[PDB]
Amino acid sequence: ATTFYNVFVKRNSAFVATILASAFVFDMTFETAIDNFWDRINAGKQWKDIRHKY
Amino acid sequence: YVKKPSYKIVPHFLGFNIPTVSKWIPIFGIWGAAAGIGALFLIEGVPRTRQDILSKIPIIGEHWIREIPASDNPF
Amino acid sequence: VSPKTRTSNLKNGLTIASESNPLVQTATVGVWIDAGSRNENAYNNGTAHFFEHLAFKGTDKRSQHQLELDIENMGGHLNAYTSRESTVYYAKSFKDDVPKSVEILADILQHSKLAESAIDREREVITRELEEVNKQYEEVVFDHLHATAFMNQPLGRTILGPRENIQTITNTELRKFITENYTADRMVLVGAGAVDHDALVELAEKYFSHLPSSQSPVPLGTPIPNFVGSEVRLRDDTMPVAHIAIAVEGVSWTSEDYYTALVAQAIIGNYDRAVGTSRHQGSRLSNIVSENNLANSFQSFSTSYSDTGLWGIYLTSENTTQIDDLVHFTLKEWNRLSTSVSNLQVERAKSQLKAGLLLSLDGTTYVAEDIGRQLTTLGRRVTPAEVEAKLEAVTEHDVRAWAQKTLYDKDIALVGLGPIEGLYDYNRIRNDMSMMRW
Amino acid sequence: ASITSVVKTSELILKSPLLSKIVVPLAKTYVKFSGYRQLGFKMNDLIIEETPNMQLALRRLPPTESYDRVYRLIRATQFSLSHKLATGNDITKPEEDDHYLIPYILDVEAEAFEKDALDNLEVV
Amino acid sequence: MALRKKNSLLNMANSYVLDSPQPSNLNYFWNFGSLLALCLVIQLATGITLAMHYTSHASLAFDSVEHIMRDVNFGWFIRYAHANTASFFFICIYAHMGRNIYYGSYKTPRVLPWSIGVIIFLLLIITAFMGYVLVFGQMSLWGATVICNLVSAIPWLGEDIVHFLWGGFSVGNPTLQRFFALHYLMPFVLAVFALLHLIALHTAGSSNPLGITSNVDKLSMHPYYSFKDLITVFAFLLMFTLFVFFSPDKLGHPDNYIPANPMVTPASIVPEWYLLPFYAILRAIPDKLGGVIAMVAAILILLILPIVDRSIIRGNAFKPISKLLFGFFICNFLLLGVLGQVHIEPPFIVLGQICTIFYFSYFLILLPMVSTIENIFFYIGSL
Amino acid sequence: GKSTYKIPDFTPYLKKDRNTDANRLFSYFMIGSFGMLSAAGAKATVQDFLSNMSASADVLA
């Protein structure tokens, strides 16, 4: 907790760098998660689900 | 017995000296990383950024290698 | 090189400590006690201060008047003060009046009457003291500062105590306090100036030998304080000068960072517009404040107790539209102890302190106060050679590391008194404890 | 540039016999063609004043020098707006072109520069 | 207390146009600021009116401008006023900048109004360039093509940026429609920056031609400078009248009366006259990216005048050598302009390179040297 | 009600572990998360919005 504070939080330069890196990770993972969830709740309905017939 | 105080003037310019600036060198480094991460994040959607930078990152890089099937592409 | 401090014990556990100066003709002998207001609870808060008044109100032998005469005849004077952790009772006299003075001190401490009639008389005098401290602005500020920093804890209580206690303090609770606290293992008999150590030890064996010892003798200067970031605003638009104190939790007497905290305090330093040299001081804050007329004065402090401390600054200003600038620039100078200080500032402050710690001791009372304070807080007098070595061990890395854990982005206790409309709210002050650029 | 700089470099030139022999006549012609004397100014009236150091030097002028400088600025302003030149006693003669301000600004700057140096001292 | 001082809104106007304390000796070169404000007001009035009749679609743009000329009542006047005032705007802005450079208006304590001024100048260039494309004649198209292709020089991403600006693979309808939206916006941004540089100036006040303080002798802005501004307003309106009514196309290129044709390339593709010196600077450097950097640096280098001018005295009125150097600098700037519109042929290729070197060496070498020496001549010469 | 050295009761609000690094770190985790979603939201907003200026579907056709 002290260690974590000292490395990532105490210096604002480090804090902002950590926030931006986390935003990058969040953005990429959230995209993938939503895409999969969207595909499950709308299963059989989307073009990708019927494409194979054609 | 001491006749005179013992000191030197360190080189300075615009109120900066090397001892002080040296303490901030690492901070410029981290700010540069922050600016780099942020810039790259801003242009992550640009196709060239994916093609040239992001897809080349080991393991992770396959996140940015995505092909539209030829059947689904009007263009 | 100053003469060696000699130290002896009695059987009860009373320490005798002396430092002779064959160049002076006066002597300060007295009793330093490792006890003070902090030893009271909430119900008897004010007792230690009450006792200090009664100590001079007559003993089993000498009445109030006889006491007065005896001291008058000695030729010197007696003095006492009670603090949160320390009580002192000393006598300044002529070289050959030392046996009289030791005898009077031993009498007023061990054999005081504490007569109901005198309790009742002082009960009014002390009640009047509650309405006249109000004028001593620095003391008002520091007492509120302790009250808020150590909210609802023993260090947070005042020395005078509440009005309610003053009306209900009995001779019973006075006697109980001094019986529990003024024990031989907590007391040091100190002599400085024209005193012989061996003479003083004999006088101690004569007068202080029948002192109670405590059941469980802990070492001298033995104590958990939980600092509260907080503020007290005592706005008074009719006052022309604003008085502001800002402090963080500091270091105890025996902290490993004790010298690092002193060096950091010396980097900010003091300032007073009325002193001629103050416009030329090296301190950055001093330069900002003097160039911009932001303050009449400021004084950095690093107060220590047995188990905590307060480190901070006390400011006075008539510039009521730029209090914000004054506070802003002060806290930005503190930020630089974490971000920017180098060997340049650190070596300059060490130079100034190596002399400062010796300069302070320029009279027998100052020497006695130094022996007494060190013996009751550390258990020993630290030689100037050891002090020079501990100061030399402070590096710029130590200062930055200390400031990063003690100052940087930490809660402050803040007290403002007077025309402080321009002092911003807690958040805006506390936001200056860090720098977004770093 | 600082007045200190200008004064020191000028003194180096005035020391060297060769250099002074060639620079002093040029400087005198320059001043004649400059033509500030034809608006009744002294050279020091032209120095930029909107600086902390210069404001402090001006505050240290003796009252008489200060009141006369105010008049020369007002008079020159009136010649400027009228598109006229000074005549007669309003023209600054070479012997009246005294460096009234230079000593004050050199003292202000001496302290300012010493303060900068001493802010950078390193205990040895 | 008078209402003009008591009411906060009135007092803002009062502080800038009425009680504003001015030096009593401003000469006529202090009138370009109000002429620039006049040009800006004319461009807003005529520009918004043209927007009521213009169509930004590439199939209709050029014809909508002909409709304005032929069918809209007084459309010819509104169009020619807008087109000619764009040139007058640049004459006044060069005069205002030349005044500022000669009189040391960039020196402390006026660095901030000068620096915001440099941005105003960049916004005016962008505004005028986009407005010229809107006609969609041959010069409109081909000028947009070559100027927008300079962005291709930006390393790595340059080509992508160009396609992004165009909204396609060449200058076409998407580019024209976006240039219309931005051309409408940019004058409002320019007005905000013009206001910012005045607010920044208000802390020191106007400089004056002697370079000394005016705190000793102030005049109200009104009535003195109000009435002195009317003289140059009417002089400007006379010049405006002679171009707009008697020679409306003197400052233009005939090729812009031919509809844009991506196939046929015009004989010579040149920017409007006011951009010509920067174009000559770009041609001087053989490298594409080098040329673009030089061209931008030629404007941004104005930001270093506060540093490279080492004089202890503000302005050139009393500095004969600085006055000569300034004369050569200005004439060189005009020669660069001329060289921007000659053909890339001998001997103009080398001459353009020499003039480019002179342009930069003014800021980097000559002004620092001359200002150093003049400091010494003032000191020694008056001992 | 009269003495100003008797601090009013703040026990309903005061945290016991107020001086600890864990205490500060928690509040900065909230601030940091908020800053992180604001960064991710700004990036998404800017990217989707500015893409309007890239070649439209009819142009790419």
Ligand code: HEM
């Ligand atoms: C600083 C202000 C402005 C400048 C320097 C400027 C400059 C120009 C230029 C150079 C042209 C090409 C003129 C031609 O040759 O036909 C033009 C065209 C145009 N401008 Fe502006 N303009 C400005 C403000 C405005 C404003 C505020 C509008 C509001 C929409 C606007 C609308 C137009 C329109 C519609 C055209 C195309 C019709 C035409 O060519 O006349 N302009 N502008």
Ligand code: HEM
């Ligand atoms: C829309 C364009 C502009 C307008 C409307 C404008 C307007 C004005 C006005 C009204 C003044 C005060 C009167 C005067 O001295 O003439 C002024 C002063 C000034 N302007 Fe501008 N300006 C513009 C562009 C620029 C540019 C491009 C620069 C610099 C590159 C600039 C730099 C300054 C400076 C330094 C002053 C102070 C000059 C002094 O009084 O000594 N301005 N401007």
Ligand SMILES: CCCCCCCCCCCCO[C@@H]1O[C@H](CO)[C@@H](O[C@H]2O[C@H](CO)[C@@H](O)[C@H](O)[C@H]2O)[C@H](O)[C@H]1O
């Ligand atoms: C030129 C276009 C005309 C419109 C004016 C521009 C609108 C924007 C102006 C407001 C920006 C704030 O501008 C600021 O206003 C206040 C009061 O108005 C001025 O204040 C000044 O005038 C008032 C009285 O007139 C005095 O109390 C004050 O001592 C003086 O500094 C500032 O010098 C000016 O910098």
Ligand SMILES: CCCCCCCCCCCCO[C@@H]1O[C@H](CO)[C@@H](O[C@H]2O[C@H](CO)[C@@H](O)[C@H](O)[C@H]2O)[C@H](O)[C@H]1O
């Ligand atoms: C200063 C900021 C820096 C420059 C700003 C960059 C501007 C343009 C960046 C990329 C814009 C286009 O970048 C592109 O964005 C869209 C989302 O908008 C993404 O497209 C993704 O989502 C959209 C809808 O959200 C879907 O229709 C699409 O099938 C999917 O791939 C692309 O994966 C990305 O390649």
